[PDB]
């Protein structure tokens, strides 16, 4: 019994796709091997995503692994939910109950809020964007309403001088504490703008909210003098991760691009663990004596009324029942498909 899975990699996903291929090679049983069908597309575009998903579906894929933007996400959740096609993804968690979707990324809300309480922040500033969604914003707003926080919400995704302005009024109001909730790129940008006008001076505390804190370059503010705190999904001291890096740092840049680095992006690591999860899931499918093989041709995804394959539901369950140890830590999901039992490292940037 073979198995065919579709993939979707945004343009610029090079290292991610690399770790995908590495996960493909590393996790391989002789009885069956996954059959990736790769599609490069612009993920921010809903039409492109619709078309790619239908292209995979009609090709008779058992499961799909991919990414989504704040735009395309609803298209993915709705189409998966309608056609009963499982979707694995490193992309940001969804706010709500979405069936036939497995979100590899852990929810950051709890960690963040608990950290805010930890540093005892009664009042602070929050710089967000619209990229990964406003769920976190709603969270900090509600928790602020309950705990009587003075939080200042500023969307930095729609925008140089303005930054100087906001940091000026912050300096006058004496709010040092800031939370950056943004894309890696946006974070880098904001930090650059901080250093240029010298708001990285002593007395400031920054909280970077993302699982990527060490995955990016922290070298710029390292000498800044301001306290910085972050989140880490992958512990590089773990033997699993240690051996992974051991094999990863020795890879040829020719075959797998961006592989020769000593570290790896959390999205990429999640891609690898995603490969693991699909492998173990289908392993549990063939080991339980339930044959998954597609009854009829998938057909036209648009064909009305919809035509979901019933047996595919099993596959969904098979995924959600998976419990394994990957790079990201202990991996287990709930009925809705959200990560459960995850451990998030709390980091801090110091002189050393």
């Amino acid at each position: 019994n073979s198995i065919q899975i579709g993939g979707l990699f945004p343009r610029g996903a090079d290292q991610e796709y690399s770790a995908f291929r590495v996960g493909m090679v590393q996790f391989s049983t002789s009885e069956f091997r996954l059959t990736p069908h790769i599609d490069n597309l612009e993920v921010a575009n809903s039409f492109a995503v619709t078309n790619a998903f239908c292209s995979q579906f009609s090709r008779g894929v058992y499961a799909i692994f991919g990414f989504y933007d704040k735009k395309s996400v609803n298209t993915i959740t709705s189409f998966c939910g309608t056609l009963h096609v499982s979707f694995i993804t490193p992309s940001f968690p969804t706010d709500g109950t979405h069936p036939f979707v497995i979100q590899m990324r852990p929810d950051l809300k709890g960690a963040l809020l608990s950290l805010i309480e930890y540093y005892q922040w009664d009042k602070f500033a929050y710089l967000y964007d619209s990229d990964r969604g406003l769920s976190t914003l709603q969270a900090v707003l509600d928790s602020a309403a309950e705990k009587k926080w003075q939080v200042t919400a500023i969307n930095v995704g729609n925008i140089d001088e303005t930054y100087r302005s906001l940091f000026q009024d912050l300096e006058l109001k004496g709010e040092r504490r800031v939370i950056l909730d943004c894309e890696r790129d946006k974070v880098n940008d904001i930090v650059d703008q901080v250093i240029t006008i010298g708001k990285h001076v002593k007395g400031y505390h920054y909280i970077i909210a993302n699982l990527g804190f060490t995955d990016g370059d922290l070298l710029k503010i390292q000498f800044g003098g301001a306290e910085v705190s972050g989140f880490q999904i992958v512990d590089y001291d773990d033997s699993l991760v240690s051996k992974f890096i051991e094999r990863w740092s020795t890879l040829e840049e020719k075959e797998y691009p961006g592989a020769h680095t000593a570290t790896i992006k959390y999205t990429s690591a999640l891609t690898y663990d995603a490969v693991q999860v699909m492998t173990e899931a289908f392993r549990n499918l063939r080991k339980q004596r339930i044959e998954i093989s597609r009854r009829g041709n998938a057909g036209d995804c648009l064909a009305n009324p919809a035509v979901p394959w019933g047996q595919g539901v099993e596959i969904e369950r098979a995924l959600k029942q998976v419990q394994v140890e990957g790079l990201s830590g202990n991996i287990k999901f709930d009925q809705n498909g959200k990560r459960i039992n995850y451990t998030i490292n709390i980091m801090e940037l110091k002189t050393n």
Partner: protein, 85 residues
């Protein structure tokens, strides 16, 4: 023209608290200073006493680093005492 002790009180507590948010983490040491800022902004019946004395005392005797919010929230309902002497 018209000066009300009540409105002066609300203004007092508010300006103290609004001041203490500039000094966050150092608040316990700045309570008195911020109180004088409130006294001088909202005005007082007696320059010596300030806008609300009882509030100042309660706060100075409670406020701890990063404890501001709860401290103010518990001290603003206190009796101002006597505004004259």
């Amino acid at each position: 023209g018209p000066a009300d002790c009540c409105r002066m009180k609300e203004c007092c507590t508010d300006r103290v608290n609004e001041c203490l948010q500039r000094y966050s983490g150092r608040e316990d040491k700045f309570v008195s200073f911020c109180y004088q800022e409130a006294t001088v902004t909202c005005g007082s019946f007696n320059e010596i006493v300030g806008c609300c004395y009882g509030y100042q005392m309660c706060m100075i005797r409670v406020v701890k680093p990063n404890s501001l919010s709860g401290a103010h929230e518990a001290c603003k309902t206190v009796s101002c005492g006597n505004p004259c002497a």
